[PDB]
């Protein structure tokens, strides 16, 4: 009972219109060409009313009335393409939530899936329970393969909220849309059943707080150099300081040197102008919270972070529980350190921004994320 | 498949439809119309809960429940028949060859699936057992051949390194003459070494020059 | 400071000669745990750090690639390094290799060197698997292709035919030709990876 | 008078360092707030020489420059074996900006590894050649250490004479002989040298089954170890008690 | 949950006279006690500016709806610069009635009192020191929770909150030593040493003790209808010049 | 199943009421009435029996088709293993061809080093020279 | 992109003239000390001397640059044009300030006379 | 041509600071060595000009703008206060006249 592409669901006309009003005209033209090449309804002759309309510079309302009232709901595939192009256009509206893919002994499993043969097996596994439709595309900028699973129900066929699962190219970490219903668990379980084909895979979740964009969750946990350093160690993930060994030795860091400010090790911060020292102090805060050089917004904004510092003084466990919030936490802490409100000589590593978008207990000086 | 609709349609179209018109008035072919209408009115009067549109719906639901209870027994008895190698016991590539269109040949996964299939119309059983034995022998011979081929490849690699080194260093392309006159060059070298040893014995007659010559000769023949 | 500049010049070029090997250790100190003793006015490092600098040398462009870093920190109650930060992509289980070496506990510097050697062998494996297909598409034996990040699943073109490979560590384990005679041309290429360069001229002659 | 005197009295009474390559560690650790490698070049060279590549003597011999390249002749002396180390001498050609290698060639090889490193040094990848030479020296040192330990723990009860160069040790008792192969194969037509351990028993009359001895060696080395795995094989080939 | 609002008083006044004019103006009967309380009663003070005249003043109405039952706690000292202040709970109209009477009768000036950060720290410091009848001061413990709300660019960091449980608070106080000031000698240097956040300079919003009180920048929420002597002594001491 | 339908038909008939109200003409009337009722309930019981037979047969063959769709035989397994045997035979053939090429190279080397000669006298000369060298070494 | 070096040379010029004044006064004190192994008028005379030195350096720069379209020339010309566009406004503001203060003096004197008269009258009224 | 100007200006700054450091060191030397008309003799004896001219004229322009804004704001505030006080002066004069007339009438 899997749905083919030419099926027509029962969607409202005003909400498809409001969705289509959020797109530019050239993607509407390419969508018009691709849909009339695929299915059609109401070759070169019907392209003539569009090649001259956009060359004249007409409004978008005329072309969306043309693309909606010659397909007079469009289909399931066209609605999937509309919502996926909305995802590509405005990525700051969705919310992703990562989940690692362990196996067997406990070692992580790289996915390495093919976009052709994955769709039929997943749609056949999901087709035994609900009326599903699966659509898969590769993102034009990032190296991911965003899937779109939409489950239907009957009181034609009513539609539910679509559920996105984004696979990176070579990671064990799979991002999916945040939902805690029973259909989200069914789709995630069917994906973890159909991706394996050799030995069983489980999806143990790695984080509890959803991350906003897909470039942010791709920088944080996808296959990249920033996946682990992410904080004051961001000079190692972009290699600002060292060149190739075959490069010139007249311009070396050890030969030209650098300009540094002598640290204070006596606690004289609570008891309180030469703008070179001001420039070097601002550069010191920039180095501690970032790499080496707007002006507060970090590489990835993080919404919510809460630590738990468990120190131990004369055999007593002394826990404190910091709990931050906001639109960009570590840029805000950078600004507070910039107004001379937080002593940058005593800011620890985990507060500066390393192992970012994670939150957990800190025992013996070693971070360990929450399960 | 769609048995409740068939049950309810059979009720509504072959029990009430036969007990409504012809079972009430068509018996007057052997007969008066007045007494036939009186008995028909009595029949429709003293029946008005049995042939209703809800009681026969409950009856059709009871028939469906009895047929589902009869279907569950054959459902549990159709999975516990003779086994004959079901799924989830063979590998991926075995059932992919069974379902056709494999589209990706991979000899390592075929070996890891052939070495995993279990053992056991008796002629078909013996033919399957012989085929399993032959396939395991194919996998054994494949592993032995791959290891022996790697050893042979390293062996001829060292042989080609020797032939390239003697083609380069001798710079004459006379490898057969080199291997033929190796013994002659070695014995004239030992003759020259014997003359040098006789000159060392009857030239210096020291005790420290002999020590230096012995140390040099030992650390040249050993290192 | 002129002869001292010459001595620093020799030290820098000797450091570059040592960095040509590929696997190097460099000193490092976290500035959170730089403590002072206050009995003498001197600074001692609380927790020692050790940084590894993996650097694979390429051959198609004949220049060194972007270096990869592994930073180890010394634990405070066990005297054994644990993997602090690493700039390695996530298709290499760098935490798993560090748990695999010596049972899990790494004490001496050669015990860290074995772990750095295993990760460097995986990086050279990825580099060589990309280099072979790029040198193939340079000579145009294959047409426009696409690769993964670790170059372990490729799909190039032939004059008409599309060929898909799932390639393991310098050997092809799966072949897929799609457009009985296909299977001979599928287990033809199912071999090593240099023989793939050999076998693709065996049919276009 | 007094106010003018007070006004006259009021009138008349009216760091950053730059670090370098050669600097001490205290001045480097005072001004350390970034997560960068330390710029003390002697300490960095001590980490690069004493810790990661021990028993190796690298020394730059000469370096010139033309017009925009830089030639560099360097030599290595792999001195893990103190008796007779094998040296080599390279000569590299930079490009010094968008820096690539144009040429690299070998001026000399000390004639102990010249054929063993003949197929290796024709891949034109000098990093793999340097790493393969260093790992071959390390594996050869471990081989002669293991064989000298096995001789020292068996020199009384048996006879212990080697073979071809050092690739196979032979023990014999009472008779019964046992040969322990250990072959280091350089790469050519992975890129590190690999080892191969295999044994062969002789009970006086003839050889034994090579498959069963291969399985016994594989299991008894996969289980116990290598330095303490071969001692169990000599204890089994003794078999006077167990 | 009786929120207290605080107001300063310019002139040192005694409500023994004119209270009959309040009873004439409001037509109720209120009660006043004229105490003399001495903060810490340990003898290392010498009684040097250590007395306070407290005028607790309720209104004897029914206690069904708590919004109409509003105390008017006073305090005073004849040596400080700003001598007196009053603090009231409740949401009645008689509060504005008695404020109008006290404005018109005595001729004083009242400003609302806003708290600083170190004043909030000292108020959480002096709202746990318990007093008993055996002339000694003991310290109870509550799982506190600080609360910040800074003003950053683009609303990057909106609000964050350090939270300290009861047992870790007691462990920090025993780790510093025997003192009557845990939150200013044990907790805040610990937070500065392990996090780097100077709490006296950061913008506090509401230093929250669990269950007992809830301080703010302008008000104090509590659980009982009364305030301790140390809280009022700290409030009167802080607003001086 | 069948037990319910024979209750539903027989309870709703002419026979359950006109038997209660029961000169000879009326006797013949309701006698022919009950005879006709017996005829039609026989025909309807045969109808419902054939309906349950064809319904149970359709359900059984549907369940058997679904079960044989979710199971495997032991003949298409034999065809699949024949195909796998053909693939492994082809792999063994190409491996044997590579072995043959490499041993032809080794046999090409094998005749390049043979020296058919008088190599006992050269061995004796080498032994005599080695003995003279050892004598000159031990005499120094 | 030259604005960064512009403010950098501005701050560096400020530090330059600060240490130039410091060098002048310290060389004067050095000559006072080393001339043989301290009043108000003498200190004022040295201050006048340094003012005349800076004055002569200013006019030397002016006669060297003025007496076209060269480097760092139009900055000084536009600065000298823009510095003297407010003197008339300053003098008008100071004159308006003096007039407002005189009117406030008149109003306060009238109010003080009126308040003394009302105090005397309301004291006689009791 | 501007970066070399910054370079020679910084070189002159370092030279003048070295001169000041050696001068203060000489001051310390003669004061640690320790335990009239010559002032007129001093009064007879005695890269910089663009710096001090640009500095002085820029500070003059900025301080003139600041003083003008400050004095304009204080002038308009004093003007409003003067108008208010003149109004209250007139009303108090009228009430003084009425109270004088009431003093006559009773």
């Amino acid at each position: 009972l899997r749905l083919e592409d030419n099926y027509v669901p029962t969607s409202d006309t005003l909400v498809v219109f409001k969705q289509l009003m959020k797109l530019p005209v050239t993607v509407l033209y390419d969508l018009t060409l691709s849909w009339f090449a695929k299915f059609g309804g109401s070759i070169y002759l019907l392209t003539e009313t569009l090649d001259l309309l956009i060359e004249k510079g007409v409004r978008r309302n005329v072309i969306v009335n043309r693309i909606l009232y010659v397909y007079w709901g469009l289909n399931v595939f066209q609605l999937a393409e509309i919502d996926c192009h909305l995802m590509i256009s405005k990525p700051e509206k969705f919310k992703w939530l990562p989940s690692k893919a362990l196996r067997g002994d406990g070692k992580p499993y790289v996915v390495k899936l093919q976009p052709a043969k994955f769709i039929e097996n997943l749609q056949t596994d999901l087709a035994k329970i609900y009326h599903c439709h699966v659509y898969m595309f590769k993102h034009p900028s990032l190296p991911v393969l965003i899937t779109r699973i939409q489950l239907f129900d009957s009181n034609p066929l009513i539609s539910r909220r679509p559920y996105y699962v984004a696979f990176p190219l070579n990671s064990p970490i799979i991002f999916h849309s945040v939902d805690k219903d029973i259909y989200a668990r069914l789709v995630l379980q069917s994906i973890s059943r159909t991706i394996s084909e050799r030995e069983t895979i489980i999806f143990k979740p790695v984080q509890k707080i959803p991350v906003k964009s897909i470039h942010n969750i791709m920088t944080l946990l996808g296959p990249s150099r920033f996946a682990e350093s992410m904080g004051p160690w961001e000079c190692y993930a972009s290699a600002n300081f060292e060149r190739s060994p075959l490069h010139d030795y007249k311009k070396h860091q050890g030969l030209t040197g650098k300009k540094v400010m002598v640290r204070e090790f006596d606690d004289s911060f609570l008891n309180d102008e030469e703008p070179e020292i001001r420039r070097l102090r601002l550069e010191k805060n920039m180095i501690k919270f970032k790499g080496s050089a707007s002006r507060y917004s970090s590489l990835v904004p993080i919404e919510k972070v809460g630590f738990t510092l468990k120190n131990e003084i004369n055999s007593r466990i002394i826990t404190i529980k910091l709990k931050f919030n906001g639109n960009d936490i570590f840029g805000g802490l950078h600004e507070l350190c910039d107004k001379n409100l937080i002593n940058i000589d005593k800011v620890p590593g985990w507060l500066a921004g390393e192992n970012g978008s994670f939150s957990g207990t800190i025992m013996n000086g070693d971070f360990q994320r929450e399960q | 498949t769609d048995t409740y609709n068939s049950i309810s349609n059979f009720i509504e179209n072959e029990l009430t439809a036969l007990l409504s018109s012809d079972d009430y008035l068509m018996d007057d072919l052997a007969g008066p119309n007045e007494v036939c209408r009186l008995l028909k009115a009595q029949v429709i009067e003293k029946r008005k809960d049995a042939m209703s549109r809800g009681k026969q719906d409950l009856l059709s639901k009871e028939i469906y429940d009895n047929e589902s209870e009869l279907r569950a027994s054959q459902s549990q008895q159709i999975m516990e028949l003779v086994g004959d190698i079901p799924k989830y016991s063979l590998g991926s590539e075995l059932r992919n060859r069974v379902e056709g269109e494999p589209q990706s040949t991979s000899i390592e996964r075929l070996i890891e699936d052939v070495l995993k299939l279990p053992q056991m119309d008796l002629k078909v059983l013996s033919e399957y057992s012989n085929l399993r034995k032959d396939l395991i022998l194919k996998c054994q011979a494949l592993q032995i051949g791959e290891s022996k081929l790697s050893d042979i490849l390293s062996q001829t690699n060292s042989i080609n390194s020797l032939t390239t080194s003697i083609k380069e260093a001798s710079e004459d392309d006379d490898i057969s003459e080199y291997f033929a006159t190796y013994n002659g060059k070695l014995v004239v070298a030992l003759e020259e070494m014997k003359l040098l040893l006789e000159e060392a014995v009857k030239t210096f007659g020291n005790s420290p020059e002999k020590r230096e010559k012995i140390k040099k000769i030992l650390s040249e023949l050993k290192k | 400071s002129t002869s001292d500049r010459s001595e620093l010049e020799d030290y820098i070029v000797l450091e570059n000669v040592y960095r040509m090997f590929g696997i190097t250790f460099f000193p490092l100190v976290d500035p959170i745990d730089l403590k002072i003793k206050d009995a003498s006015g001197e600074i001692f490092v609380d927790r020692e750090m050790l940084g590894i600098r993996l650097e694979v040398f390429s051959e198609r462009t004949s220049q060194f690639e972007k270096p990869h870093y592994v930073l180890l920190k010394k634990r405070i109650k066990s005297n054994s390094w644990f993997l602090f930060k690493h700039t390695i992509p996530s298709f290499i289980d760098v935490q798993g290799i560090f748990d695999d070496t010596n049972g899990g506990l790494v004490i001496s510097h050669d015990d860290a060197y074995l772990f750095a050697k295993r990760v460097f062998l995986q990086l050279v494996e990825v580099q060589k698997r990309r280099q072979i297909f790029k040198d193939l598409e340079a000579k145009k034996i294959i047409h426009d292709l696409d690769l993964d990040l670790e170059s372990s699943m490729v799909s190039f073109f032939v004059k008409d035919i599309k060929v898909e490979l799932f390639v393991k560590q310098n050997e092809i384990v799966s072949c897929s030709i799609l457009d009985n005679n296909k299977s001979k041309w599928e287990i033809a290429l199912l071999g090593s990876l240099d023989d793939l360069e050999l076998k693709l001229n065996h049919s276009f002659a | 008078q007094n106010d003018i005197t007070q006004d006259f009295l009021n009138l008349i009474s009216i760091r950053v360092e730059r670090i370098n390559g050669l600097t001490n560690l205290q001045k480097e650790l005072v001004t350390k707030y970034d997560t960068l490698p330390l710029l003390n070049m002697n300490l960095r060279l001590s980490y690069l020489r004493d810790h990661t590549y021990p028993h190796l003597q690298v020394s730059v011999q000469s370096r010139d420059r033309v017009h925009g390249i830089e030639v560099l002749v360097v030599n290595y002396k792999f001195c893990r074996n103190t008796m007779n180390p094998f040296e080599i001498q390279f000569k590299m050609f930079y490009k010094f900006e968008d820096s690539t290698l144009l040429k690299w060639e070998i001026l000399r090889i000390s004639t102990n590894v010249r054929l063993k490193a003949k197929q290796l040094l024709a891949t034109r990848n000098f990093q793999k050649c340097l790493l393969s030479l260093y790992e071959f020296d390390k594996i050869k040192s471990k081989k002669t250490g293991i064989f000298q330990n096995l001789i020292n723990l068996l020199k009384r009860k048996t006879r212990c004479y080697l073979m071809n160069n050092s690739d196979s040790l032979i023990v014999e008792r009472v008779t019964i002989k046992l040969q322990i192969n250990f072959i280091i194969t350089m790469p050519g037509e992975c890129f590190l040298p690999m080892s191969k351990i295999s044994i062969a028993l002789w009970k006086g009359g003839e050889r034994f089954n090579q498959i069963d001895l291969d399985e016994i060696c594989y299991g008894l080395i996969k289980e116990y170890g290598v330095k303490t795995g071969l001692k169990e094989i000599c204890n089994v080939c003794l078999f006077p008690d167990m | 949950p009786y929120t207290w609002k605080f107001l300063g008083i310019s002139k040192q006044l005694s409500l023994e006279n004119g209270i009959a004019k309040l009873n004439q103006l409001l037509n109720l009967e209120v009660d006043l006690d004229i105490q003399t309380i001495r903060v810490p009663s340990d003898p290392d003070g010498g009684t040097a500016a250590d007395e306070y005249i407290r005028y607790e003043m309720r209104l004897d109405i029914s206690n069904l709806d708590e919004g109409t039952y509003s105390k008017f706690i006073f305090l005073g000292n004849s040596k400080m610069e700003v001598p007196m202040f009053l603090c009231y709970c409740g949401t009645d109209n008689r509060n504005e009635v008695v404020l109008q009477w006290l404005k018109a009768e005595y001729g004083v000036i009242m400003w609302p009192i806003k708290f600083e950060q170190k004043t909030m720290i000292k108020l959480a410091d002096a709202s746990i020191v318990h007093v008993t009848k055996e002339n000694i001061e003991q310290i109870t413990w509550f799982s506190s929770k600080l609360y910040f709300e800074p003003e950053t660019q683009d609303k990057n960091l909106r609000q964050f909150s350090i939270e300290i449980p009861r047992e870790s608070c007691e462990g920090l106080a025993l780790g510093y030593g025997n003192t009557m000031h845990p939150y200013n000698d044990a907790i805040v240097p610990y937070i500065y040493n392990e996090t780097g956040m100077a709490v006296e300079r950061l913008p506090l919003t509401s230093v929250i003790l669990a269950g007992h009180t809830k301080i703010m920048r302008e008000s104090i929420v509590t659980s009982t209808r009364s305030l301790r002597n140390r809280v009022l002594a700290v409030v009167l001491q802080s607003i001086q010049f | 199943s069948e037990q319910l339908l024979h209750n539903y038909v027989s309870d709703s008939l002419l026979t359950t009421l006109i038997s209660f109200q029961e000169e000879q003409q009326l006797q013949h009337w309701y006698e022919l009435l009950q005879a006709r009722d017996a005829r039609v309930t026989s025909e309807l019981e045969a109808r419902i029996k054939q309906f349950f037979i064809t319904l149970r047969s359709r359900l059984l063959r549907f369940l058997e088709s679904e079960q044989l769709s979710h199971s495997l035989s032991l003949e298409t397994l034999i065809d699949a293993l024949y195909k796998i045997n053909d693939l492994l035979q082809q792999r063994l053939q190409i491996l044997d061809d590579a072995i043959q090429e490499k041993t032809s190279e080794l046999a090409e080397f094998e005749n390049m080093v043979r020296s058919p000669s008088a190599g006992d006298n050269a061995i004796p000369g080498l032994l005599q020279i080695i003995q003279s060298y050892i004598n000159l070494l031990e005499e120094n | 992109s030259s604005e960064k070096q512009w403010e950098r040379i501005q701050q560096l010029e400020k530090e330059h003239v600060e240490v130039y004044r410091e060098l002048l006064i310290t060389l004067d004190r050095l000559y006072l000390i080393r001339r043989h192994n301290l009043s108000h008028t003498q200190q004022r005379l040295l201050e006048i001397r340094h003012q005349l030195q800076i004055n002569l350096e200013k006019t030397a720069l002016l006669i060297r640059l003025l007496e076209n379209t060269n480097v760092l020339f139009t900055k000084l010309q536009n600065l000298l044009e823009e510095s003297n566009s407010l003197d008339y406004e300053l003098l008008q503001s100071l004159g308006a300030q003096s007039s407002l203060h005189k009117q406030l003096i008149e109003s306060r004197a009238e109010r003080d006379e009126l308040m003394s008269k009302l105090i005397e009258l309301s004291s006689k009224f009791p | 041509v501007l970066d070399v100007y910054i370079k020679n200006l910084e070189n002159q700054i370092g030279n003048k600071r070295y001169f000041l450091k050696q001068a203060q060191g000489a001051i310390d030397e003669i004061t640690k060595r320790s335990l009239s008309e010559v002032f007129t003799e001093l009064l007879r004896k005695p890269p910089i000009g663009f710096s001090l001219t640009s500095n002085f004229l820029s500070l003059r322009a900025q301080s003139s703008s600041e003083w003008l804004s400050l004095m304009n704001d204080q002038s308009v505030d004093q003007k409003a206060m003067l108008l208010l006080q003149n109004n209250i002066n007139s009303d108090l004069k009228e009430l003084l006249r009425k109270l004088q007339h009431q003093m006559t009438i009773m």
Side-chain angles (χ1 to χ4, degrees), chain A residues 317-337:
Chain A
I317 296 303
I318 309 172
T319 177
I320 65 171
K321 301 179 176 127
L322 291 97
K323 198 169 303 282
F324 296 86
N325 211 308
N327 274 9
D328 186 297
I329 302 151
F330 300 118
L333 291 174
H334 190 191
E335 184 172 0
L336 298 193
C337 296

Side-chain angles (χ1 to χ4, degrees), chain D residues 195-202 204-205 207-213 216-224:
Chain D
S195 315
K196 269 201 72 70
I197 311 188
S198 58
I199 45 168
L201 266 165
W202 279 290
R207 195 188 292 272
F208 276 174
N209 209 10
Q210 188 40 61
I211 296 98
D212 300 347
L213 289 177
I216 280 172
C217 173
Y218 169 69
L220 206 61
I221 280 180
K222 164 76 79 183
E223 189 254 330
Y224 278 138

Side-chain angles (χ1 to χ4, degrees), chain B residues 50-56 58-61 63-64 66-67 70-79 81-83 85-102 104-107:
Chain B
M51 316 284 282
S52 317
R53 298 295 220 92
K55 171 158 173 294
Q56 77 202 25
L58 292 191
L59 194 136
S60 84
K61 189 50 169 58
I63 293 302
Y64 180 78
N66 270 343
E67 291 301 313
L70 187 64
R71 191 188 166 276
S73 159
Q74 304 318 294
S75 297
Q76 291 325 107
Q77 218 264 337
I78 212 64
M79 313 179 83
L81 83 173
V82 284
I85 310 306
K87 294 205 165 203
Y88 63 83
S89 65
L90 309 185
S92 87
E93 282 282 341
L94 277 179
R95 79 171 86 97
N96 265 347
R97 284 320 200 278
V98 159
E99 295 204 10
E101 52 98 22
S104 88
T105 41
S106 63
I107 308 299

Side-chain angles (χ1 to χ4, degrees), chain F residues 5 21 40 49 62 65 78 83 90-92:
Chain F
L5 289 191
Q21 66 102 11
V40 304
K49 156 174 146 185
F62 166 69
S65 78
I78 295 305
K83 263 183 55 186
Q90 189 149 42
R91 190 62 150 101
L92 283 172

Side-chain angles (χ1 to χ4, degrees), chain H residues 1-2 4 6 8-9 13-17 19-20 22-23 25-27 29-31 36 38-40 42-44 46-65 67-79:
Chain H
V1 300
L2 75 161
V4 63
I6 307 152
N8 53 65
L9 189 139
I13 277 178
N15 178 41
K16 280 159 179 169
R17 269 159 139 176
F19 282 148
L20 164 59
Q22 289 151 58
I27 291 162
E29 180 180 1
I30 310 302
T31 44
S36 66
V38 309
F39 183 71
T40 73
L42 173 53
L43 288 189
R44 186 169 192 185
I48 184 66
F50 188 75
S51 63
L52 46 79
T53 300
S54 78
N55 163 54
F56 187 52
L57 273 299
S58 42
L59 266 67
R60 253 172 57 176
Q62 186 184 231
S63 86
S64 67
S65 84
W67 194 92
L68 191 50
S69 89
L70 183 139
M71 205 44 65
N72 215 327
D73 301 0
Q74 198 209 352
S75 168
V76 74
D77 287 7
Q78 272 161 327
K79 181 157 286 171

Side-chain angles (χ1 to χ4, degrees), chain E residues 179-202:
Chain E
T179 188
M180 309 316 133
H181 293 111
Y183 282 78
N184 212 2
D185 313 310
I187 280 160
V188 164
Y190 176 77
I191 284 180
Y192 167 70
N193 262 332
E194 303 312 285
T195 306
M197 297 196 291
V199 198
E200 313 155 330
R201 314 184 178 201
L202 273 182

